[PDB]
Design an enzyme around this catalytic site. Sequence first.
Site, mmCIF file in Angstrom:
data_model
loop_
_atom_site.group_PDB
_atom_site.id
_atom_site.type_symbol
_atom_site.label_atom_id
_atom_site.label_comp_id
_atom_site.label_asym_id
_atom_site.label_seq_id
_atom_site.Cartn_x
_atom_site.Cartn_y
_atom_site.Cartn_z
ATOM 1 N N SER A 161 53.111 22.197 19.642
ATOM 2 C CA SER A 161 54.211 22.177 18.687
ATOM 3 C C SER A 161 53.719 21.766 17.294
ATOM 4 O O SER A 161 52.833 20.915 17.151
ATOM 5 C CB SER A 161 55.317 21.213 19.145
ATOM 6 O OG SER A 161 56.020 21.686 20.292
ATOM 7 N N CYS A 162 54.267 22.422 16.276
ATOM 8 C CA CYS A 162 54.052 22.084 14.878
ATOM 9 C C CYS A 162 55.407 22.027 14.201
ATOM 10 O O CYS A 162 56.387 22.614 14.675
ATOM 11 C CB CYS A 162 53.127 23.070 14.143
ATOM 12 S SG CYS A 162 51.770 23.634 15.177
ATOM 13 N N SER A 163 55.461 21.283 13.105
ATOM 14 C CA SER A 163 56.698 21.195 12.349
ATOM 15 C C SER A 163 57.064 22.559 11.764
ATOM 16 O O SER A 163 56.196 23.328 11.351
ATOM 17 C CB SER A 163 56.552 20.150 11.263
ATOM 18 O OG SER A 163 57.310 20.500 10.126
ATOM 19 N N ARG A 198 54.557 32.683 15.338
ATOM 20 C CA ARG A 198 55.116 32.155 14.102
ATOM 21 C C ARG A 198 55.932 33.234 13.409
ATOM 22 O O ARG A 198 55.503 34.395 13.306
ATOM 23 C CB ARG A 198 54.030 31.642 13.145
ATOM 24 C CG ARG A 198 53.205 30.529 13.706
ATOM 25 C CD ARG A 198 54.001 29.233 13.787
ATOM 26 N NE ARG A 198 53.109 28.151 14.157
ATOM 27 C CZ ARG A 198 52.799 27.866 15.412
ATOM 28 N NH1 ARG A 198 53.338 28.574 16.387
ATOM 29 N NH2 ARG A 198 51.962 26.874 15.693
#
Lengths: 245, 262, 249, 233, 247, 262
Positions: A161-163, A198
């Site tokens: 997970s990434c912001s 993404r």
Amino acid sequence: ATLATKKATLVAALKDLQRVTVAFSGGIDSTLVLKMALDVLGRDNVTAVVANSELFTDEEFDKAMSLAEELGANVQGTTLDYLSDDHIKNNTPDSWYYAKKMFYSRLNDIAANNGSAAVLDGMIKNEAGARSLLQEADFFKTDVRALAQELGLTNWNKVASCSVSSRFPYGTTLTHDNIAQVMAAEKYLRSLGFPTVRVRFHNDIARIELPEARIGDFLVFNDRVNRQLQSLGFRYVTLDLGGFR
Amino acid sequence: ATLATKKATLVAALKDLQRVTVAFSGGIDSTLVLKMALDVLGRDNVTAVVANSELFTDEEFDKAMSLAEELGANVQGTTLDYLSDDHIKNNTPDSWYYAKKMFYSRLNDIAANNGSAAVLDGMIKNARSEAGARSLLQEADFFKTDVRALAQELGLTNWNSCSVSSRFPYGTTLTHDNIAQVMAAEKYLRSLGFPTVRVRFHNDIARIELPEARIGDFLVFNDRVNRQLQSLGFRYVTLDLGGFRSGRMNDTLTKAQLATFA
Amino acid sequence: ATLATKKATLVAALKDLQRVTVAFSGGIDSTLVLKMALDVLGRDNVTAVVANSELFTDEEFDKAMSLAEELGANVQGTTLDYLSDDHIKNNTPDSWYYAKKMFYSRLNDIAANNGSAAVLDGMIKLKARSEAGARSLLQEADFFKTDVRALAQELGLTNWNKVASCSVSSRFPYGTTLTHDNIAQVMAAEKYLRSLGFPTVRVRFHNDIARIELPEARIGDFLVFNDRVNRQLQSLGFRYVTLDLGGFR
Amino acid sequence: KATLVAALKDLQRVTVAFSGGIDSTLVLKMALDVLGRDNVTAVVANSELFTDEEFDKAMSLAEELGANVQGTTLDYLSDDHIKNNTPDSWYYAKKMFYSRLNDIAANNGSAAVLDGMIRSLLQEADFFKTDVRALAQELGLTNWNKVASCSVSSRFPYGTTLTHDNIAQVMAAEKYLRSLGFPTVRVRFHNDIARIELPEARIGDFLVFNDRVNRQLQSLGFRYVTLDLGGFR
Amino acid sequence: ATLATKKATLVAALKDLQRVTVAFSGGIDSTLVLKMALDVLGRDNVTAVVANSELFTDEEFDKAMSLAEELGANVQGTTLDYLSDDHIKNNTPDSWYYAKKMFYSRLNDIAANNGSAAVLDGMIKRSEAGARSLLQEADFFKTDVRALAQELGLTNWNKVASCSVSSRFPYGTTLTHDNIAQVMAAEKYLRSLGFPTVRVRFHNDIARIELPEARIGDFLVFNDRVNRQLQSLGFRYVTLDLGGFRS
Amino acid sequence: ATLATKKATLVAALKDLQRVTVAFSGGIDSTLVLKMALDVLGRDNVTAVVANSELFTDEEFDKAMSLAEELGANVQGTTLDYLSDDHIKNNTPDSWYYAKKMFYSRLNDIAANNGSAAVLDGMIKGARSLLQEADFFKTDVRALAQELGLTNWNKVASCSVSSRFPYGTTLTHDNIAQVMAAEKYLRSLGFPTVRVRFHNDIARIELPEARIGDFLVFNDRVNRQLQSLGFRYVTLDLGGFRSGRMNDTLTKAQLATFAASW
Ligand SMILES: [Cu+2]
Ligand SMILES: [Cu+2]
């Protein structure tokens, strides 16, 4: 060193802290720390904290909360308002600093008010008011996996997970509407079988980043993805030729 | 037989042998043997040996040594010059035997100089000729399920490969240069997401073998592979249409014509 | 309640039973029950049973047998003839009830002949199960799917059957009568397809037409196999071999 | 055909707007045949909104048909409606084009300017693409321009200011993509984003070129190179 | 400089020769020469020759022979044994020269024994054998050839110029009757699947197939069939070049 | 025999007949016959008839009739009711004959009104196929069609829709319209050669194998569109259009026994 001496280092550090608060994300590092804390100190000396925020998905938070209960921990939810800081809201190049400040400061208040000796997180080898014991014991991604299989750990979140901040260009102002737009776009793509994806936001253009090895498999979905992300408000739906990152 | 009696057979042979040297690869069988030997004879009666060569990558050598240390064993590294034997350097069809002879000869030199009674390996049921390598798991009638039954029973969970000679046609002379060329091409292909890959060497031609189910996934990488493997020294970079292990996935008619053509 | 109290109830129930026979499928539930039985009563009081039939693959049966043996259990294989019951042979919506009736009836015979006190299965919080007096001990102790996993990590279980392999009857429309030949045709077709790298696959039977279901994300990978699959499945007797455009389900 | 011969004979001295396409090529020689080479001048326009390769192929073909050929150069970007790419730019461009041809035809004594649209005497003679194809071979014509082009303005959003640079960037990117085997392609310009339109049936054949197109179109000045999922149109 | 002047030059040179023999390939240039020769000199003073060899396919010889008849010319086929010259047989980089030398010498045997004044070919804007390139002496460029072909109503020629199969072999590997047939059959099979521009490069036991990269996606469905077909033709390994056509 | 001599055979054949009727389908063969007839007999002795039926699309009929106009031919339409014959209506394996007989009786009924001698068709290598009598092959028709300046024919072969149905199935307006609408939708997407075979609730789509990879981007749109036309399951035949014609020598012979088993 051997995995035995790295684990013994971990147990000694844990034994000396006696009561800990664990920052719990649900990935394999935090899952290892949380399970090692429970097996050295027992449930009532271990508080697991899971951050609920607008910059990460509801799905990842729900799976983390249930994962901590499955590991046998008292788990707590805390809600962070990252957009209340102007650096994060306006998405400046140093936003990572203000976001991590708000997180560890909230985690320090939780551990201070329940009598914990430190805050633990899952940082490994290869934030000063946090103890990263796996990094203090020289764990590498290989070691964390070796030690996890030995303890029978099996159910962490397997995709990083990434912001959601990273889907927006520097200088773009994050709002509830456009974050929700990206989240629904990425959620639908994951539902088709693409767990790593993404949707980069360029206002009326969505730029989709996929791992290049999956772009061939994605072709069967073009038209459904085109129509779905247009119903979310994008005018142009595109696939980035460079792939993921 | 029962799994409980096969273990008792294995311990009896270990207890009677008193001091042993184990060829340790890192797979489940050598891991089981090493851990039973360590558990029956104790750490100071067990030398674990790991071989380093030009025919295998340094990464497997590093991970095998780490597995033996993690098992708590006294571990020794020895490095072989496989290319000094001309049956191996000139890659004749029996090099597998001359390579295993050179390997077992070094292991018996290690066992003679550290006072061990035998050399043990991890061969199961379904070289030793002149060496005396004893496969105690196969002597005690272990099968692949019995090895896993005993491995879970003893808390083993962390185990880990083919010789690079297989990438060259018989008669082609292996050299430090062409071995390195083949190993780098395979590593670059693995980095793109293709863990099962072979780069077969035909002098100026690279012939890539892939599992057929991945060839469609590969097309986005053609030009990058072509230029990468050209900079590694190949003039032509090509993809085998039969894929990795030809014939296995064909129908009963063309499996039989692909085998007749071999 | 807590995991450990539901664990204790489960341990109490096993202690009273002394000798058990376990219906073992290989999924997370049956492996949990079997592992709790092995650790409470010892290997010599626990028989694990795995059923073999025409409606399931030889490959799923072999892995279930190997999982039970690898987990340290005495394991027994029993072969059922499901096609001898008219309700299963005619592929009606109640065929499953009669199939599980035939299963639990055989398991009560195995349990009588080895001196077992109960038959155990892996059901958590069904008509055939109760009529046969087989016990779902996880369900009595109020286990839910999260408790099953919490307990399984606690005991170090990390291999079970993650696929929920399904009876071959679902490859035929309701009312089409199952035969040895058309079952074998479908089973070989799916076995051939899995061997190419497609573990999730259905070959739906439409008499002379085979309709293949693949996950849409895999269809592109399939193209290199068109001609081989076409001829292999024709050699099994299908006249027309087709790929469903809608995919899996 | 009888209709077409009637109209040209009556026009006496003509100038032909020459596209290089099959329709336009019929009109030039069709006329050269009935009015003579000395009274039929072919004009082909050179502009920033169409490609050099399409201009060069048209002019040499007019000589190949046996014609007095003239190249006039139009500066479409001198009009503010074109320079700023408004929704009616096609009208202001078409005015500049036909006005330059009415200067050349007035000047050289041409009675009319003719074009190839199915005065469009081919449209007057009830020609369709099939009728044009049978008659063109009938005089032994085999060489035109098989790719019918569209103004580069369609690659730009309404309101985007055309410049010499951003046009050239778009033109080189489309030229590269055609060189790889994709004759029907558009590179739509969104500042730092390039959005590629391909016919959906070719998107699969394209996969082998992703990485090269990415780097090529970045060296042309784009930061992000993308493929539209909805395809051409 | 005009086309008319260039045409008149060509007509004058043909009138001067009176009896000619033309090396006829079927391309647009050889067709222009042949049609202008037939018109200025008439059918009985014009011999069209088409060369037949192991280095080109039979259907390619037949298509040129039938096109020469379509122009209304007396055409004779002649067959060359190129493999008899060791410069061609062992595939040195100058093999093209000895093939063409052997070619033009056979054309002068025919032209001597039918009483012709020159051997004509279609080179536009040999020198050993006295072969005349009248299109070159008349200052023709590709646009002049095209303009003159339209003037005479010429519309039928070979648009795909064929290449000797020698390019499928590395320098130094020796051409044989068998390995040419092997390569030609492999290419024929690949064209039959819908891939008209293709090369099967020969590397002994390896076939290296060159395809235009934009077709490689379309090729995947035939992989196994191509693999087994070319093995049944004698190749041990069948491969696809990652660099593509003219890699 | 050169084109020159076979053409003269054809020209000789036409002059003797004086008055002709041409069965004009629009393909390369009939266009050659029709254009050769006009050049030998002139517009006053060449009646061209184009058939309209329920078994072919309106697009074929209009494309064929427009071409006769370009060839300057006197062309008339005629409409056949193939569905009035029980052999065609119920699609038995000889349905093809009763269809062609019903066709030829109309063409000879017209012959007398025209006053023509024979009726001509495009059959190559009481009907008359002059191309067949003059030894024309597929290659000869192509050469003479270029020499005569013809470039309009219908480049994709069209066949009666009866072949889209299993033998024994009753042809109806409903199911014919369903099959034709499915095919036209697929042609609209860029696949000019396609068949939608009708298997009641199953549609089986046949594509040329070189196009199947190109099709994947349309899977979902075709699936849903053809469901809206009445099919429950929309499928893609793995053998493709004209199965076996493009296979290697061994597997072509095997798909030919598979075919002849039915
Ligand atoms: Cu894939
Ligand atoms: Cu394609």
